[PDB]
Design an enzyme around this catalytic site. Sequence first.
Site, PDB file in Angstrom:
ATOM      1  N   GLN A  62       0.585  -0.905   0.124  1.00 44.15           N
ATOM      2  CA  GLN A  62       0.378   0.181  -0.252  1.00 44.15           C
ATOM      3  C   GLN A  62       0.758   1.127  -0.117  1.00 44.15           C
ATOM      4  O   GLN A  62       2.185   1.123   0.745  1.00 44.15           O
ATOM      5  CB  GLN A  62      -0.694   0.204   1.435  1.00 44.15           C
ATOM      6  CG  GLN A  62      -1.880   1.369   1.291  1.00 44.15           C
ATOM      7  CD  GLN A  62      -2.291   1.013   2.501  1.00 44.15           C
ATOM      8  OE1 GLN A  62      -3.482   0.698   2.910  1.00 44.15           O
ATOM      9  NE2 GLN A  62      -3.516   1.997   2.582  1.00 44.15           N
ATOM     10  N   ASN A 101      -8.985   2.823   0.090  1.00 44.97           N
ATOM     11  CA  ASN A 101     -10.135   4.186   0.994  1.00 44.97           C
ATOM     12  C   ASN A 101     -10.513   4.021   2.185  1.00 44.97           C
ATOM     13  O   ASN A 101     -10.271   3.128   2.762  1.00 44.97           O
ATOM     14  CB  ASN A 101     -11.812   3.668   0.021  1.00 44.97           C
ATOM     15  CG  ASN A 101     -12.403   2.655   0.066  1.00 44.97           C
ATOM     16  OD1 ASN A 101     -12.234   2.008   1.028  1.00 44.97           O
ATOM     17  ND2 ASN A 101     -12.508   1.744  -0.732  1.00 44.97           N
ATOM     18  N   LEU A 121     -12.358  -8.177  -1.381  1.00 39.19           N
ATOM     19  CA  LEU A 121     -12.096  -6.595  -1.820  1.00 39.19           C
ATOM     20  C   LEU A 121     -13.408  -6.431  -2.876  1.00 39.19           C
ATOM     21  O   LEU A 121     -13.604  -4.889  -3.169  1.00 39.19           O
ATOM     22  CB  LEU A 121     -10.592  -5.805  -2.111  1.00 39.19           C
ATOM     23  CG  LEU A 121      -9.937  -6.818  -0.993  1.00 39.19           C
ATOM     24  CD1 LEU A 121      -8.453  -5.941  -0.910  1.00 39.19           C
ATOM     25  CD2 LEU A 121     -10.619  -5.844   0.827  1.00 39.19           C
TER      26      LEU A 121
END
Lengths: 164, 11
Positions: A62, A101, A121
């Site tokens: 990430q 998000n 996801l």
Amino acid sequence: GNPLVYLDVDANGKPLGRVVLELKADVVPKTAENFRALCTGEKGFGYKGSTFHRVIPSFMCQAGDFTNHNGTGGKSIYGSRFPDENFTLKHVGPGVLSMANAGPNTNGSQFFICTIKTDWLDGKHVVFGHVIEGMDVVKKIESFGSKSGRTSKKIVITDCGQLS
Amino acid sequence: XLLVTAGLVLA
């Protein structure tokens, strides 16, 4: 006809190599355009010099928080947040590029590159591209993470931009 | 768990 972008990534200042990402503007034009422009810096801000702040082996890497550098920030070319464009593309396997998000319609700049199929996801994160080359570099990034997400080295996007 | 959020990281 889809955009292509790159990330050149260091670990503690030592180059790891280049990751080349295809952006699926044919499916998610608005989400692809955000990522492309954050790579080029053409709006006056973007990913260059920011980090992979959360890296979890066998899950994902990430990145994208260029404002706060810690997972709390980032902003898009459309403002702080923009809506989920669609959920057409799925989290099919390693190499998928998808938006991080904080719930519905909160896309900003943070993103992740999957190192496995993250199909739980689907319908929650907008998938908008995939790695074309440099999956070996993603695996090097992954090796500097841990189950907690904490990295053992500072993993920096030393350069980024468009190739198409 | 295994999520990818931006601010409150969850289980």
